């Protein structure tokens, strides 16, 4: 954890303090090293050249390298810093004379430094790989990368987690150094670099997509863009799509780019060469499958509710000689569901309900292991809080159907719950309407944004005031003042008086204790005037602030539902995307053109 | 008061008008003073050189100083202006030749001017101390402070209220003169200046903290910041903390900086060298003590409410031969609380309630005299309106427990009130939740921002309309139209009809007077359509305006609760902050490092 780097840094400062060699190296004097005139480690992995290269002392570097020739060719102890080449340390400080003298001594330019501070991790800040070439090409030393590649410093290589120098240069906050170094490393390759995967299994194109570097994405696209006729204003250009649509792999680029946990992947979809394709797909074959499947799901759910509304009956058997026993029906035995001939179609409806539940479970069971569990449960782009309520509705319908087949009493307790869950399951289908798009995404944001806070602050006030009212009314007879008879219905009545549905409990034939009157007068201005209206104002404030993000999230999830319902249906029905090129002689590469106007 | 300075200024203008000496001094002519050719006061403390230095007349200054040599070495009458050195007057106007000629005459450069217009007070505007060196170093005369310190003008000194020249230079709206003069006065010190307290008892570091001058705080910190290895992008720097964490004094710097009445002390906490420390403390040992103490307080309060819900009973003794007598229970004698064996644990619960009240009173009794009464009662950072309701709940539980032990009738009147107060006391514990943080601070701002105004304007309308309805319904029999029987329940029914809980009083078997109908139709559109909705809109407007301040206030109070629950618990459990330096040889100075990235 993070009480480790401080301790080893203080120990390293102790070890540079005590020994006069490294202390004079940090001092960079004249009559120190010659007056003294080696392979001893520091606190953890540091020789004499390391602190000299770290504090940029050229004369000390030259004096030590002409004193001991073998000392530059020496790695460090590897407990917090594996390898720790002096070249790799000095290239970050970027001294021309120092890197030239180090290559004159001829250090191992193909070294490897998989240190504990050298890893793609949220602990460290920099992620620079484990190579001096990667260090130079990510810092931006354009005059030094040529001297590094002069001695052939392994233009293709792996490291810890096995990515490459191009992925290192991509995964970086961009600048001019990034684009110039990308062009440089692409030129100095002389299939071998743009095609190599990693141990995460990604093409550099797809890794730039899953990160979100839009300018690197466009500068990689612009090397694969052939131009047709350009008549004045309008320009008809062409794009390649064999990277953007693999259609034979495990994870497509369009499917992977929507599934990241990073909150910048969604902005990649408004760039042209994926936006035109997804808008063509959504204008032709997105809606005329989604809407008809939604209509069939509407018909299935209304068939389920009109089948469940005809629940069978039996009259009462035991008497009700206690005045609060109103149970006028009961559920009869299993033998009489097939006795009446006006219920065979009702059993057919129960069969189609349980068949729909089984088929939706069998569809969604492989849909749980494609990308991660939190990638499928909480990503509002893919629709997590619709998936969980769909699978809960399916499992509860299965449980209540096997309870019906086992013929036990009290079946309505899963029935009403599964019925309201399956009917609110329709709200997933509000992605194919321009009106119904942002409103559901607003309510999905709004629940876990503020209704959680409002319920968490309402609960303590209501739990206080219900107990207060019950203490003040336990000395009161309940046959006239009906409310607050026992404690749970007092809790419920206070909840209702909070949300102002029920009227205030008042009988105008007798007198009421004044403590109730003063406490209810306090409760009115602490609940109904204040907190409900403040909740309304707070949700108006937060709607004013995140009205910007809803349309971007809606575009992200419509591209998500297009790629999901492209992957799901078999390829006998969905067309092959784009136009083929074998009838025009380019050869087995599908292509697309856009007609822009600059 | 403020009808004093005007009178003495008019008298001073009278005294410069009447005497031709000072009038020619203000005139600055040639053939006036030589044609006339002294120690007479003005209206209150003014000789001839004072008005000359005040109106910047160099030839008059030279002529008077070569006429009378002793006259420059002369203070003034001290009733509104004590001392009033001519050097101290002239240094504000900042004339080089005049200050050089005054030092050539050799005035008392170590003078002292504790005038009525010279004090740290909200009456005056400038607070410049009582020294010419302080005057020069706060004005910004960088070419004149050297000539002042040339004759050794007491680089360390006190004044009225006993602060120093460095505190004078700190307590000022900053500019370039301030930072350059701070560096100058630190250099010209040759433990003696950075360590001296005042008669308020503050180090200059702590006084700059309690004022709020962030740039002076950082320029004082930057003289105590040693730098470790700087490898390219990332930089590992070190801070000293023996000023920021005294841990042996009466008032720590972090404890004092949150307790000021100034509304700029809260912005100091987003500066790095205190922010990293308080975030480390809140991430390690802030929440895992606060949350478990909150859970134990939740358990104590729910034990209190489940003990109070089992209030003992006795049936009615006197009959109810009047139709509005519903009192079906009564509180029995003290002898039967220990009669039943199903109430010993209830008496145990009453004992733990009164023990919790006694222990919370014994904890909060020394917490009332640490910083001031209004510093502890109204500062929303420290939590005043939670402290007062906690101590009120404790005192009222003590009163109702001694009333139970004395066995008097009518005990529920403090019981319900203390119960609702102790249950709303949980709302203090919404500081350790990122969701529950700003919402409670919004409601605490909102009550005393606008609900006061809305209640103050609602009261007069409701007091009018209740009297109107009661006058119109005193000619009506109450056995059918139950509402508005007597005046207080008419007041309450109008309050309820304002806040729209109860429905409108209507019986559809008889007729009602038309004055009621027209007045209730006026009351509807003057209350429910208009004023409730306008209150909703006003609180939405003010939420839109002070949505900015809530997160800053929340950061301020989380640093406040960290320093308070660091000071409160004994030091056997809380760790010593930071890392020690004796095992690394620096010596008895705890230190901290930060890993920034520029
Ligand atoms: C929208 C959803 O409808 C419900 O209320 C249904 C049930 S009723 C319930 C009753 C007592 C205790 C927990 C319940 N929970 C339900 O889910 C809903 N809205 C909200 S807002 C804040 C919460 C919450 C989160 C964590 C713990 C306790 C409450 C919440 C919630 O749990 N559900
Ligand atoms: C939030 C608090 O709950 C209460 O109402 C409880 C009691 S009822 C009451 C009845 C008649 C007269 C005074 C009362 N006071 C209470 O405190 C609360 N909210 C507000 S808004 C404006 C005021 C206010 C301030 C100064 C004088 C009169 C009223 C106020 C208040 O005093 N208390």
Author numbering:
A (entry chain C), B (entry chain A): 29 to 65, 72 to 224, 230 to 637
Authors' text:
One of the hit compounds, ZINC9155420 showed robust (~80%) inhibition of rabbit TRPV5 at 10 µM, and did not appear to have any selectivity for TRPV5 over the closely related TRPV6 channel. In order to verify that the newly identified TRPV5 inhibitors, ZINC9155420 and ZINC17988990, bind to TRPV5, we utilized cryo-electron microscopy (cryo-EM) to solve the structure of rabbit TRPV5 in the presence of each compound. We were able to resolve nanodisc-reconstituted TRPV5 in the presence of 10 µM ZINC9155420 or ZINC17988990 to 4.3 Å and 3.8 Å, respectively. At these resolutions, we were able to clearly identify that the ion conduction pathway for both inhibitor-bound structures are in non-conducting conformations. While severely limited by resolution, the ZINC9155420-bound TRPV5 structure was still able to give us some insights on the interactions between this novel nonspecific inhibitor and the TRPV5 channel. In the ZINC9155420-bound TRPV5 structure, the density attributed to bound inhibitor is located at the interface between the S4-S5 linker of one monomer and the S6 helix of an adjacent monomer. Two additional densities appear to bracket the compound and, given their characteristic elongated shapes and their presence in previously reported TRPV5 cryo-EM structures, they have been assigned to lipid molecules which may be involved in compound binding. In order to functionally support compound binding at the S4-S5 pocket, we tested the inhibition of ZINC9155420 on the M491A mutant of rbTRPV5. This mutation resulted in a right shift of the inhibition curve (IC50 = 9.08 ± 1.45 μM) which suggests that M491 on the S4-S5 linker is involved in ZINC9155420 binding and inhibition. Unlike the ZINC17988990-bound TRPV5 structure, the S1-S4 bundle appears to be occupied by a lipid as seen in other TRPV channel structures. Rather, in both inhibitor-bound structures, this econazole pocket appears to be occupied by a tightly bound lipid molecule.
TRPV5 is a calcium selective ion channel that is responsible for the fine tuning of calcium reabsorption in the kidney and has been shown to be a critical component of systemic calcium homeostasis. In the cell, binding of PI(4,5)P2 is critical for channel opening while rapid desensitization occurs via binding of calmodulin (CaM) to the base of the pore. The transmembrane domain (TMD) consists of transmembrane helices 1–4 (S1-S4) bundled in a voltage sensing-like domain with helices 5 and 6 (S5 and S6) domain swapped to create the pore of the channel. The intracellular portion of the protein is primarily composed of tightly packed ankyrin repeat domains (ARDs).
